[PDB]
Design a protein around this ligand. Structure first.
Ligand SMILES: [Zn+2]
Ligand SMILES: [Zn+2]
Ligand SMILES: [Zn+2]
Ligand SMILES: [Zn+2]
Ligand SMILES: [Zn+2]
Ligand SMILES: [Zn+2]
Length: 208
């Protein structure tokens, strides 16, 4: 997002964040106490349903703001209380790269997953469709990209992780969410429906 910077002035009717109806983010130059900043949550635990303000706003919990859910207990890795810090923590479901049951190379999940559960971060560079076109004109052995939306693309060619091998389908069982993660947009992969162990993962490359 576009950070605001209006020294010695609050984030009022003249602040571009307030005008564009967006929260001020980590890199905005307003006070830490800016009323237009995201308040975080005060959940008991989990943070993986619409009852969590962070989850509802497509944001991971912030260790400096989400002080009660377990987001600040960053040293813990087992049966974690906040289920909305996985991208930050580098946690993912166990995945297997193997020949696809359809064709080429595929991804198989090794843990059962519920509808809308987080699977893995999809690593890569978020680039504009203009930079994606520029790259596609001029290359590597094999490139890995998908469309996030009408303006942005994720290129996993230079900075990807295993999940980049998950095949395309117009009837996918996975989807991507562009999420706010400690001031940065990062891509999360979630189950579209409940998936059982051993199932091949697919997502729609046209849009997610
Ligand atoms: Zn502002
Ligand atoms: Zn701002
Ligand atoms: Zn502000
Ligand atoms: Zn929460
Ligand atoms: Zn939170
Ligand atoms: Zn949380």
């Amino acid at each position: 997002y576009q950070p605001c910077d209006h020294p010695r002035q609050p984030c009022d009717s003249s602040c571009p964040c307030v005008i564009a109806q967006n929260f001020c983010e980590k890199f905005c130059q307003c006070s830490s106490e800016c009323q237009n900043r995201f308040p975080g949550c005060r959940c008991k635990a989990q943070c993986n349903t619409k009852q969590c303000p962070c989850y509802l706003a497509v944001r991971e919990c912030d260790p400096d703001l989400c002080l009660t859910c377990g987001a600040a207990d960053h040293w813990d890795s087992k049966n974690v209380s906040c289920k909305n810090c996985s991208i930050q923590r580098g946690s993912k479901k166990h995945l297997l790269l193997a020949p696809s049951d359809v064709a080429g190379w595929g991804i198989f999940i090794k843990d059962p997953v519920q509808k809308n559960e987080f699977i893995s971060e999809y690593c890569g560079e978020i680039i504009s469709q203009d930079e994606a076109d520029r790259r596609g004109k001029v290359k590597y052995m094999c490139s890995f990209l998908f469309n996030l939306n009408n303006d942005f693309v994720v290129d996993a060619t230079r900075k990807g992780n295993k999940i980049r091998f998950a095949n395309h389908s117009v009837n996918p069982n996975c989807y991507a969410k562009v999420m706010m993660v400690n001031g940065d947009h990062r891509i999360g992969i979630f189950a579209k429906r409940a998936i059982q162990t051993g199932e091949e993962l697919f997502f729609d490359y046209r849009y997610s």
